[PDB]
Design a protein around this ligand. Structure first.
Ligand code: IHP
Ligand code: A1ACV
Ligand code: ZN
Lengths: 369, 134, 504, 501
């Protein structure tokens, strides 16, 4: 029974991205409802995120970007085309009712979670609302409008010394890496698929520059990686980083679009190994901060996030889903875990040894402290 | 990868002697709705949850909020549970019928569906759409 | 080799000692008729021929010349019956290697070239006879393969006689057909509209009192299948956000029929057809693929695309039950070379060996074991992409990609569809060429201009379509590929206006 | 590839058979020689009888065409051989003959007598490869008499540079005027003493050739010995890296000339003509020009591009120095071919390579530029030891990759010898590439990466780490694999970064 605080609002489940769009902000509400039927509330605090504002939001983004996101509305759609087409808030990040309201809700959740973590009141802070780690400084990308994990890390940096960022999401966390590509107080470790995938960044040879050299550990993979390989690649590198970096706060972005068979997913990882990875990072009793981000199949996302919330609390849960409003929604297997698909992995053992050895050489160059 | 002050963040500096002064000054940015009670076991909570379910129609969130509203006192919660009507989105049968018609005519475009249902905000029809598809 | 040393002794492997001999024989042995030692006379005319080339190229002459009978040692040997002109063509082929096969004079060359065992000409004539059997001789060439044991022609002349069994029923040649041929033509899935039961009953009705108990042996072996040979059309109506999937059915009674529409409503890009069902990559994010069904109009779900690309080439291959995707563009104007292939029975997307030169927006044509990447655009080091002209051959059995040397007569965006061996090609500035991969040559076929053209091939005839629909005459041209007889069909009530993709 | 409009594939067309060269060429070698029917001519040479076929012989050699088609069943050839004519018939029928050094000249004379042009050219090349000093005045006599200009030049180049010890041979004393004029007017070296050769040739019959003597003096040219083997390496403790310029002598005394000792750094150097070209500087772009006699470090135009571990190959045919492959500081293996002109001091581009390689070995072949091995990029994020042979033409500016591959891979150093491309690599195994007939040979070495330099007809292979085993400078006889050890008189190097041939 460790003190874990949780953030949820009833408004985040209503915002709609449009017809035929991958990301559905209704998934978080069903994830909360699955927790709302497992009894996990009895051993975990539940808070309501506050609606964000401008001055705490402008700490990273430019003023004109926030002004646009405040002034946007679907009613003057055919009146401000230039402003849309410059800031890339068009067909890749569709506009809708209360877009800035969505940004307020997610930003308030993540920043208040950082305020809880940074005050030694709650050890592990969980917020599945935010985690949008693709928004850049003055432009939207990857369905992410405002970069919340960067704001959370910026808040943690005012009190802590060194903050370690962990990225399990299938996409490259370019948004967080872009902001901290020069500073020396944040180490961003991102495991992302890159043969041609979105966003195409995250090459091996891009490690850092300026003051922040060797303070960004990128790690490419290939499609179809199974569970045992992923564990064998996630245990050594994380132990090595936490041995030579000694951070005081770990912000883990627990992505959920790397599971077995999402619409934009490509990996072949089950919930069991994903939970084993997060438990591995959790087993270092550091001040944690969970985030969301990603996830494009509502059933799999709900199952994965409910099992992650269960493992963060160290509570065993039955495999059979309980009496609720979502009997036929989760069918027909009615279970919690997901069987792996038939995708054939393309990352051989020798490739994995070579990439781990290269990362070890890169990390040996960290200055002694 | 781009480099420039127009892309990266302006990191604040660290002061070892400033952590305590800054920590105790900031407010708790959030309102509490539930806290665990160690003296309150699971049996009577499981009973009271079905109590709120079947005769009065309370859902999980509103029923659990009342427990903290009375500081985890089940008896007082039973006393005051009929006094508060759990105000839902009042979807009358006619509202379901026109929502049915509008979905068939226009599809997933809820902005247009608002036109035949002007009294309901979009954030409310999306919730009913996800609840109906069950 | 450790034994040979270039300064003491080595073996001189001469790679030019095939051109010199083959040119010396065609130059010195034919243009002046010297060194003749055998005289072959066919139908009066006297020939002078050299025993060496003949005996070294056709084993039949090797057996005739090197026999032990005293008739062979006589100077003049007489061939009983081939022809006057056919034997001239055969001598021309044996010496030079270039013979002008004609449609009027092919079957004679087929039988004779099989009698003399010139297997290369025999195979070429087999293919060229498989090309030109429409319906009329489809039960006379079939009988010319069962008697000669050439199963490829026997299959290609059964496929085109099964699908016309209705009209073929009344012909007396079908009525005089022996049992084995009828058993082999019926037991392969006669189409539903051909009335095979009427055909078998009419075949018995010739002598029913002698074959009545013999009749039911075939009724217990008849197979039935429904007509599912289509020409799928996709195109939006330029005003409605939903792009339909009109499914044309090609009939033989000058009435090309239209089946039910599908009308998916997201977006359409780079679709493919395989078997009897349509595959389409689409959605707001072009990664998810829908699987359409023809009879039961439903939009099923399949495994989404694992990678990110646009303007790629979807090629169907029914040989190993796969759908290949090749080439493409990668979101930063970088042309990629990578082929991911999908299996219908497993819903998995794996990789294979990569292409040599990356192309995008090309046209692919299946050839029952070889996937051809035709044209498209290729990268240029001057920061740009130029209209490409390369013919990239991607194998699917051995998985090796190689680039053919010769190039197309034109370049740019193009659409291709196959016809019985060939890869027909059309592009902007109408000029219909007729690719042929086995002997690597082109032809041409002018089109009536008085707008990019689309090609779909079905029922033996080739239908070319327009992009802009404003009613000139019917904007749907039925082309006869033999005599270039460009006719115009009806297009009964097609409501299309853009015609984004036409699938063969 | 001809878009013919007359032919239609459903009516008529021309069946161009591309397999109708193998069938006849195999049918003749199987049916006409293995069991010998269809024989209609009988050629008897030195008692032994042949049955042959006038068709093939008259279709391959024009002399037999003029013979058979003139205006008896058995015809006897006057004088060729028993074995040479057997080899000639075997080549005419099959297409493979085993050329030997002992019976080569006879085959050359006969193959030119019967006008088999391909074997005549192959014998010309193979006989040009094997003239050291002994028959260099006998082969020259068989080139002027035979009108074979390439062999005549090849047997004159190797005879001009050995004029000192060739003076006392009586064959040179009985040498007619024209060949002497042509061997003298080519730039006889300084140490060969040409004037004493002139006087000694006249001294046979001076009272009859005295007035004829001065006709050659008015045509003699003089030049100094400037055939060098440039060595570049540091001494592992001094920043400046020297450029010792060896001079190869024929009296078992390899001489060392003056050093130059540039002081910045050296990477990817080359040699052309008689001077040295080097790439160096703190930023690897500025280029120095080294002169041997007048020891100076001249300046040339810098590199217009940015690359590392690239291959510099000399092309004296068009007075241009090329640069292929390399690495562009982002671990991206580039394929860009830039060339520099000596007389114009410009740095322009050409076509690009097909597959990019880095750190290979380049060998000029008097018209084609060979990229040998190295390491090629892998889509598996890394570099594997490459094995392909990349061809880069310099006359037509075309690039293509040969199908066959090397027997090994990795880092390697290459040098040429009169037609060939000699190769050594790690784990010594001397292979002898031959591009004209596409075959490999091997030459074992007595067992550290090795280096190869070519001069004076022999090959010299060096070591990287010196520490004195015997001399660390091996002279190899490429004919009988006679690996001997030279002196290396007072070489003070310790690294041997590059060896320029
Ligand atoms: O109503 P939405 O939230 O927009 O999502 C629906 C829903 O998918 P989710 O369960 O992921 O929300 C459908 O699923 P079912 O109700 O049929 O289980 C799915 O249909 P498929 O099963 O065919 O995927 C459909 O997809 P589509 O629009 O392609 O028919 C998809 O709609 P969106 O594409 O708009 O998200
Ligand atoms: C979190 N996350 N995960 N995946 C994505 C994501 C997001 C977007 C795309 C995407 C994946 N795949 C895509 N493929 C294409 C096809 C294509 C290929 C090559 C060249 C051009 C287009 N176009 C896409 N967007 C267009 C590009 C122009 C821009 N104005 C927005 C619309 C996207 N986001
Ligand atoms: Zn993601």
């Amino acid at each position: 029974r460790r003190k874990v605080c949780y953030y949820y609002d009833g408004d985040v489940g209503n915002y709609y991205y449009g017809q035929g769009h991958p990301m559905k902000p209704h998934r978080i509400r069903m994830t909360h409802n699955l927790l709302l039927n497992y009894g996990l509330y009895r051993k975990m605090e539940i808070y309501r995120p506050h609606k964000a504002n401008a001055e705490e939001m402008t700490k990273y983004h430019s003023d004109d970007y926030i002004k646009f996101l405040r002034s946007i509305r679907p009613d003057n759609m055919s009146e401000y085309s230039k402003q849309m087409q410059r800031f890339n808030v068009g067909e890749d990040c569709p506009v809708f009712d209360g877009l800035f309201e969505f940004c307020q809700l997610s930003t308030g959740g993540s920043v208040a979670s950082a305020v809880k973590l940074n005050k030694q009141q709650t050890d592990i802070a969980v917020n599945w609302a935010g985690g949008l780690h693709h928004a850049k400084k003055s432009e939207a990308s990857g369905f992410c409008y405002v970069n919340d994990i960067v704001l959370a890390i910026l808040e943690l940096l005012k009190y802590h010394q060194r903050v370690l960022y962990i990225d399990i999401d299938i996409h490259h966390g370019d948004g967080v890496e872009e902001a901290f590509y020069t500073t020396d107080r944040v180490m961003t470790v991102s495991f992302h698929k890159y043969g041609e995938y979105f966003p195409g960044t995250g090459d091996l040879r891009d490690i850092g520059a300026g003051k922040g050299k060797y303070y960004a550990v990128n790690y490419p993979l290939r499609d179809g990686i199974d569970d045992e390989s992923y564990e064998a690649i996630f245990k050594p590198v994380m132990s090595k980083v936490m041995e030579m970096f000694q951070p005081s706060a770990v912000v883990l972005q627990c992505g959920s679009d790397s599971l077995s068979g999402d619409r934009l997913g490509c990996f072949n990882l089950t919930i069991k190994g994903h939970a084993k990875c997060v438990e591995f990072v959790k087993s270092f009793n550091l001040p944690m901060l969970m985030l969301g981000g990603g996830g494009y199949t509502i059933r799999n996302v709900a199952r994965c996030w409910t099992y992650e919330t269960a493992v963060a609390l160290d509570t065993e849960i039955p495999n059979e889903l309980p009496y609720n409003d979502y009997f036929e929604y989760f069918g027909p297997d009615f279970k919690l875990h997901i069987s792996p698909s038939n995708m054939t992995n393309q990352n051989t053992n020798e490739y994995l040894e070579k990439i781990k050895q290269r990362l070890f050489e890169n990390l040996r160059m960290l200055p002694h402290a | 990868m781009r480099v420039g002050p127009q892309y990266q963040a302006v990191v604040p500096d660290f002061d070892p002697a400033k952590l305590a002064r800054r920590s105790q000054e900031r407010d708790n940015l959030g309102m509490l709705v539930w806290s665990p009670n160690q003296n309150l076991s699971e049996a009577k909570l499981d009973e009271y949850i079905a109590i709120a379910k079947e005769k009065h129609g309370y859902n999980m969130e509103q029923a659990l909020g009342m427990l903290f509203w009375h500081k985890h006192n089940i008896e007082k919660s039973l006393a005051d549970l009929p006094n508060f009507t759990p105000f839902p989105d009042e979807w009358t049968v006619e509202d379901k019928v026109l929502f049915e018609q509008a979905f068939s005519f226009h599809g997933k475009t809820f902005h247009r569906i608002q036109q035949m249902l002007p009294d309901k905000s979009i954030a409310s029809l999306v919730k009913f759409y996800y609840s109906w598809k069950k | 080799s450790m034994d040979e040393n270039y300064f003491v002794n080595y073996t001189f492997k001469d790679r030019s000692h095939s051109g010199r001999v083959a040119q010396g024989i065609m130059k010195l042995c034919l243009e002046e008729e010297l060194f003749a030692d055998v005289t072959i006379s066919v139908e009066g005319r006297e020939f002078q021929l050299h025993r060496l080339v003949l005996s070294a190229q056709s084993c039949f002459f090797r057996s005739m010349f090197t026999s032990n009978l005293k008739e062979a040692h006589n100077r003049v040997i007489v061939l009983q019956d081939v022809s006057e002109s056919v034997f001239q063509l055969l001598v021309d082929y044996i010496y030079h290697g270039t013979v002008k096969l004609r449609a009027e004079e092919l079957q004679e060359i087929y039988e004779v070239s099989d009698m003399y065992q010139l297997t290369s000409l025999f195979e070429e004539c087999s293919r060229f006879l498989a090309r030109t059997v429409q319906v009329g001789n489809c039960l006379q060439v079939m009988w010319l393969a069962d008697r000669h044991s050439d199963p490829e022609l026997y299959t290609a002349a059964k496929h085109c006689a099964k699908t016309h069994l209705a009209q073929l029923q009344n012909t007396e040649e079908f009525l005089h057909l022996p049992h084995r041929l009828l058993t082999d033509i019926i037991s392969d899935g006669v189409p539903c509209s051909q009335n095979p039961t009427e055909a078998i009953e009419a075949w018995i009705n010739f002598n029913k009192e002698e074959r009545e108990a013999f009749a039911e042996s075939l009724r217990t072996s008849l197979k039935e299948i429904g007509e599912n040979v289509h020409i799928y059309l996709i195109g939006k109506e330029s005003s409605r956000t939903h792009s339909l999937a009109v499914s044309l059915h090609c009939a033989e009674d000058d009435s090309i029929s239209v089946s039910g529409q599908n009308s998916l409503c997201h977006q359409i890009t780079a679709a493919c057809k395989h078997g009897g069902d349509l595959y389409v990559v689409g959605g707001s994010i072009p990664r998810r693929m829908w699987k359409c069904n023809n009879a039961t109009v439903d939009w099923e779900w399949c495994a989404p695309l694992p990678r990110d690309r646009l303007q790629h080439t979807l090629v169907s291959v029914p040989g190993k039950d796969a759908i290949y995707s090749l080439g493409g563009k990668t979101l930063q104007d970088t042309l990629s070379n990578a082929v991911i292939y999908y299996r219908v029975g497993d819903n998995v997307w794996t990789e294979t060996t990569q292409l040599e030169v990356a192309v995008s927006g090309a046209a692919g044509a299946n050839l029952n074991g070889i996937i051809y990447l035709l044209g498209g655009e290729e990268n240029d080091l001057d920061f740009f992409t130029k209209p490409s002209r390369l013919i990239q051959c991607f194998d699917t059995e051995t998985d090796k990609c190689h680039v053919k040397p010769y190039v197309l007569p034109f370049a740019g965006r193009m659409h291709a569809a196959v016809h019985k061996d060939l890869v027909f090609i059309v592009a902007e500035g109408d000029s219909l060429v007729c690719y042929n991969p086995l002997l690597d040559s082109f032809t041409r076929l002018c089109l009536p201009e008085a707008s990019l053209w689309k090609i779909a091939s079905c029922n033996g005839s080739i239908y070319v379509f327009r992009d802009r629909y404003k009613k000139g005459d019917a904007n749907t041209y039925k082309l006869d590929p033999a005599t270039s007889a460009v006719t115009v069909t009806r297009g009964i009530k097609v409501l299309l206006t853009n015609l984004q993709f036409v699938l063969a």
